[PDB]
């Protein structure tokens, strides 16, 4: 359980460029990091696109452009999560179609959980910590686009109050992905068995890492339930956009995820 935990933690370190530790020293102005360029209005968003942060489909409008940048980040994160998941021997022994089912229904729960690592009450890191976008700027955009990020901030700040670290997060994200009750899963008993091992490891770890945090394990099982519901709401928002924002482009991978939800 301890060697198991360490292995998943190494896979997490190996596969995610931004960790919470890195994100926190950037956000607190630690000596070994260059400060991010702050995106707080339309002119700074435009400067960031010119080269101060970033070196997409045809430009439509400000709100849509921000949406396109949201898609770039989540699709890149899906890439990192796939590699992370593959780095767990038990995951890679599953038939490839089961691996796809798990990632399809698990990646957004994992994304919204990890998002908390790069967030404070004022905004979020973007572009590998090279930028900071303000929560206020995001709320200012047109209706469907402002409404989709705000609930993630809301979840994140309460989640952040639990004070997890990267070693905790490794096990938590592994438990999210390796979930046996996903629709269309083929070998349910094997996946459920892998997941309980991960969960046991997580409880074993939290006892050592957070000794005075009695109730932390059941608190986290509830966050998994909350994430499932936050993704259900997000998929409905995404379907509305597809239906009503017909000039707005959506990445083919994302179309494949939200199909059937
Ligand atoms: C300049 C704008 C930078 C982008 C800010 C958002 C970046 C990361 C947050 C990821 C969650 C955003 C929620 C919207 C996700 C829509 C795409 C998807 O569903 O995959
Ligand atoms: C390891 C070899 C892979 C064999 C491929 C078997 C194809 O199964 C397909 O897997 C998909 C989930 O991933 C589902 O969306 C489809 O409904 C299902 O038909
Ligand atoms: C690595 C990216 C994670 C994969 C997420 C996308 C999963 O899409 C699914 O892929 C299957 C083909 O394999 C299709 O049968 C399903 O219709 C489709 O919904
Ligand atoms: Ca389970």
From Swiss-Prot:
Residues 37-260 form the NR LBD domain. Transmembrane segments: none annotated. One of its GO terms (biological process) is positive regulation of DNA-templated transcription. It is found in: Nucleus. Its main location: nucleus. Keywords: Activator, DNA-binding, Metal-binding, Nucleus, Receptor, Transcription, Transcription regulation, Ubl conjugation, Zinc, Zinc-finger. 'Lys-48'-linked polyubiquitinated; leading to proteasomal degradation. Deubiquitinated and stabilized by OTUD3. GO terms for cellular component: chromatin; nucleoplasm; nucleus. Disulfide bonds: none annotated. GO terms for molecular function: DNA binding; DNA-binding transcription factor activity; DNA-binding transcription factor activity, RNA polymerase II-specific; DNA-binding transcription repressor activity, RNA polymerase II-specific; linoleic acid binding; lipid binding; NF-kappaB binding; nuclear receptor activity. It comes from the Eukaryota. Ubiquitous with maximal levels in placenta and skeletal muscle. Ligand-activated transcription factor key mediator of energy metabolism in adipose tissues. Receptor that binds peroxisome proliferators such as hypolipidemic drugs and fatty acids. Has a preference for poly-unsaturated fatty acids, such as gamma-linoleic acid and eicosapentanoic acid. Once activated by a ligand, the receptor binds to promoter elements of target genes. Regulates the peroxisomal beta-oxidation pathway of fatty acids. Functions as transcription activator for the acyl-CoA oxidase gene. Decreases expression of NPC1L1 once activated by a ligand. Heterodimer with the retinoid X receptor. Interacts (via domain NR LBD) with CRY1 and CRY2 in a ligand-dependent manner. Belongs to the nuclear hormone receptor family. NR1 subfamily. This is Peroxisome proliferator-activated receptor delta. It comes from Homo sapiens (Human). The lineage of its organism: Eukaryota, Metazoa, Chordata, Craniata, Vertebrata. The chain holds residues 175 to 440 of 441 of the full protein.
């Amino acid at each position: 359980l301890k060697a198991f935990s360490k292995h998943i933690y190494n896979a997490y370190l190996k596969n995610f460029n931004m960790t919470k530790k890195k994100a926190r020293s950037i956000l607190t102005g630690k000596a070994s990091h260059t400060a991010p360029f702050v995106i707080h209005d339309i002119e700074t968003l435009w400067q960031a696109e010119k080269g101060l942060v970033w070196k997409l489909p045809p430009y439509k409008e400000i709100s849509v452009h921000v949406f396109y940048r949201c898609q770039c980040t989540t699709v890149e994160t899906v890439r990192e999560l796939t590699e992370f998941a593959k780095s767990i021997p038990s995951f890679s022994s599953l038939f490839l179609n089961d691996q796809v089912t798990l990632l399809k229904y698990g990646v957004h729960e994992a994304i919204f959980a990890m998002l908390a690592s790069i967030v404070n009450k004022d905004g979020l890191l973007v572009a590998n910590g090279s930028g900071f976008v303000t929560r206020e700027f995001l709320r200012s955009l047109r209706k469907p686009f402002s409404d989709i990020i705000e609930p993630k901030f809301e979840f994140a700040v309460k989640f952040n109050a639990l004070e997890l670290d990267d070693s905790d997060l490794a096990l938590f994200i592994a438990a999210i992905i390796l979930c046996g009750d996903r629709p269309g899963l083929m070998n349910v008993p094997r996946v459920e068995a892998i997941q309980d091992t991960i969960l046991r490891a997580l409880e074993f770890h939290l006892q050592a890492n957070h000794p005075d945090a009695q109730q932390l394990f059941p608190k986290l099982l509830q966050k998994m339930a909350d994430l499932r519901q936050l993704v259900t709401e997000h998929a409905q928002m995404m379907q509305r956009i597809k239906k009503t924002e017909t000039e707005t482009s959506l990445h083919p991978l994302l179309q494949e995820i939200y199909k059937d939800m």
